Structure formats: C-alpha cells, structure tokens
Write a protein that binds this ligand. Structure first.
Ligand SMILES: O=C(O)Cc1c[n+]2c([nH]1)[C@H](O)[C@@H](O)[C@H](O)[C@H]2CO
Length: 437
C-alpha cells in the first residue's frame, strides 16, 4: 500500500469563469474572459462562459457531490468583477453573498476551502486601464484582496494570490491565445513583473488583516527532458516556464539567470527597485503539473520534439515521473516550508455508456500514476501537504471551449446533469483510505 501522512488534504479544484455561468448576474461587471470569448475567432466553436456548468445556480448540488465523495478540501476561485464590478471602489454585496454561501456550506460539511483570489477573470474596467501592464494594478489587486480578507478571512484560512502568473502574462499578452489576447513581448514581461508586485502587496495586506491563516501562490510546471546529451534548453524552459521565474524573485530577489539572458531588454529598466518588496514571506507553494516535454535547442531558441508516448485528448504526453521531479526540484531549489499539488488531471474523450456510467479507466490510470509519484516525493522528505484533482467537473476549457473534459464528474450540458465518472468513484476510495493500495 501507499499511505499518505495523517491529515493530508485530498482535494478537487475549479475556477469561477470555467464553471459558474451567469457572468453578469446580480450586478457583476464584465470580465476580460467575457469580452474575449464574445469576440469571434478567440474560442473554439464560439463557446463562452455564459452558461458553463451553471454552478452559479447549482453550487449546493456540486458541494453535496464533494461531500458524498468524502473529498476533504475544495479549491475554488473568486470572480473579481462579481466582488468589485469596476475593479476598484464599489463593493457588490450580492457577489460576496454568493461566495459566503459556498464557504459556509463547505465548513458545515467539514470541507476545507482553498480560495484562489485570481484565476484569470480580470474586471474588464481594469483592462481598459491597461490591466496587468499597468503598475497601478499592485494597488488595485491589494484593495481587492483586502476586501476578500475582511469579508471571508474569519472562515477561510488557506489563500492563493495568483493562478499561474506565467500563463496570465505569456499566454495572455505574448501568444494572445488567452484574454486579453495581446501579442507584445514588452507588455508580457511588464505583466510578469506587475503580477509579482501585486502578489507581494496582497500578502503584505493579508498579514495586516488575517491574523490566522496561510497564503501562497500557484505555478504551472512541465517536466522538460533533453532530446540528446549535447541540456541548456531544458535549463531555460525550467527557469522560464516553471516556478523559478517567480520563486527566484520571491526567495532570492532577482529573476533566474537564463530568463535575464533572454528577457532583460523587455523588463522595466529599474525592475530591481521592486525586488525587496517582492520578497514578502509566503506560507506555501502550489504546483500545478500535467505534462512532460522533450526539448531541443533550435536556432526563444527552443522547440518541442514530439515523442511516441501515451497522450491525453489535449495531445499532452503522460509522464508521471514529472510530478516527482518537480516536487524534488522545488525542495532542492527553494525549500518552501509547505508544498501543495494544486492541480493534476487529464482530458479524455469521455462517453456515457448504455449502462449510465462513464468508464474512464484512462483517467484512473493517469491519476493513480501521479499520486504514486507524489507519495514517493513525500517518502523522500518533500513537505507535500495536499493534492488537488483538476477538476471536480467538466467545464469551459478556455480557448478549447467545452470540447475538453477534465472532470471526475461528467456534465451533460444539454440538461446540466452530473454523472460521477469511474475516476470520481476511484478517487473517493483513495481519499477514504488516505492513499493507494
Ligand atoms: O498550463 C499548464 O500546463 C497547467 C494547467 C492546466 N490547466 C491549468 N493549468 C489551469 O489552471 C486550469 O484553469 C485549466 O483548466 C487546466 C487544464 O488546461
């Protein structure tokens, strides 16, 4: 058997825009994902988050699913423009009420809330003022975070400032594939820097407002392996695409060496002036992990090399040892006091069989392998306190729309029916047993 530490936090994760629907209900302002998805050409099939999983109405049912599965923690995000419709200034009580009911329900049912303050749904009003490109967002984000802390910090004790600031900056402002859909490398690196400044300011406010409780930050990570033994390209991909881009500032007070080699000219001229503030002490690091990649130098002087490995419906290579590597590596490089796996999961072409069940053995095999590697990292000293499956529900998968299903629960979008998949049932047994057998 593979048993986890006593009180290890087994969880599931979601994000507001991906599951809620009703983006403009009850006085909410538009987000940048509302306007981006309503722009033709940006999202597969013209899909939007207008309805999604209708969690805005079905939240109680969904939480009852978490309870019934015996899952111990729920990672969810708060929609900034539901709380402050113009981004700063006015606070919307109906937006607070929505999350208040979720928080109280979770606590009543003995489920630990983990709140992501920002999972990509920036208020549109702030994007008109440059969004993450504007230095003033450190102030706007701090004011937003302070409202959440004042309203919920009595009950919610586990907070995450940002989900995947690399994705927000680079996919949103360089690749242009995510909101706000820009392609400018100078803007993208100023977003990187302002995301760090905003994170640190929010942590600073947290220490002033919520006497009890812990705050951290979540990074996307890939497992990069070299295509040959000629290695530096892997080095750069790790430092740029993984936690070091942000953790080197936080722990060491500067960007990683190979990031500066690539991107110095794109960063603000006096960016180091902000570094002492960026070193604000954090309580844990959240790592998201899904895929491994074979990488070679290619005259960012990096290209991916396709491997003949099992892949998910995203085309992502399944490399379970990657989750072990990233956990070992984070300890070795920055030694954070606590780590969580804040997302791990897979998209497959799920079908409801004639027997009414969703037989996703492929997803079971994926989760089991990665949970096994996480267990290993714990045996070797990594202070992993929890593990969150992405996602509770099939949902709006950003620019892929509804075409990619990551849930351990199937959603029939025609009826909003939830069908617990085989992977959901399997996971519930893992949680009940506190591990694998
Ligand atoms: O970017 C990565 O490699 C890691 C990643 C996967 N995912 C995420 N990050 C986001 O946090 C989620 O909102 C997505 O739904 C999910 C699946 O794509």
């Amino acid at each position: 058997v593979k048993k986890f530490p006593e009180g290890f936090l087994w969880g599931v994760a979601t994000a507001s825009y991906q599951i809620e629907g009703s983006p403009l209900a009850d006085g909410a302002g538009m987000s940048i994902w509302h306007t981006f998805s309503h722009t033709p050409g940006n999202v597969k099939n013209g899909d939007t988050g207008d309805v999604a999983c209708d969690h805005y109405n079905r939240w109680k049912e969904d939480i009852e699913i978490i309870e019934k599965l015996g899952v111990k923690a729920y990672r969810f995000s708060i929609s900034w423009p539901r709380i402050l419709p113009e981004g700063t200034g006015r606070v919307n009580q109906k937006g607070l009420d929505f999350y208040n009911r979720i928080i109280d329900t979770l606590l009543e049912k003995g489920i630990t809330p983990f709140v992501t303050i920002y999972h990509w749904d920036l208020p549109f009003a702030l994007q008109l003022k440059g969004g993450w490109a504007n230095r003033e967002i450190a102030d706007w984000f701090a004011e937003y975070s302070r409202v959440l802390f004042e309203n919920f910090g009595d009950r919610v004790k586990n907070w995450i400032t940002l989900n995947e600031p690399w994705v927000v900056a680079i996919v949103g402002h360089l690749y242009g594939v995510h909101a706000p859909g820009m392609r400018d490398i100078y803007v993208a690196f100023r977003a990187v820097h302002n995301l760090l400044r905003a994170h640190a300011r929010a942590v600073k406010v947290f220490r002033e407002t919520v006497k009890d409780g812990k705050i951290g930050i979540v990074f996307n990570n890939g497992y990069f392996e070299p295509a040959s033994e000629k290695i530096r390209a892997v080095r750069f991909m790790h430092q740029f695409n993984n936690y070091p881009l942000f953790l080197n500032p936080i722990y060491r007070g500067d960007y990683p060496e190979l990031v500066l080699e690539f991107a110095r000219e794109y960063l603000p001229e006096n960016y180091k002036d902000d570094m002492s503030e960026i070193q604000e002490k954090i309580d844990f690091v959240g790592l998201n992990y899904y895929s491994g990649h074979l990488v070679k130098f290619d005259p960012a002087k990096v290209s991916f090399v396709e491997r003949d490995l099992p892949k998910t419906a995203m085309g992502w290579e399944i490399v379970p040892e990657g989750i072990y590597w990233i956990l070992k590596k984070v300890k070795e490089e920055y030694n954070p006091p606590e780590v969580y796996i804040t997302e791990n999961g897979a998209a497959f072409d799920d079908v409801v069989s004639e027997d009414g069940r969703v037989h996703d053995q492929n997803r079971i095999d994926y989760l089991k392998a990665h949970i096994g590697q996480a267990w290993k990292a714990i045996q070797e000293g990594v202070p992993l306190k929890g593990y969150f499956v992405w996602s509770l529900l099939d949902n709006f998968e950003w620019a892929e729309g509804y075409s990619k299903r990551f849930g351990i629960v199937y959603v029939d979008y025609s009826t909003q029916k939830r069908i617990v998949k085989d992977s959901g049932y399997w996971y519930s047994n893992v949680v009940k047993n506190n591990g694998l057998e």
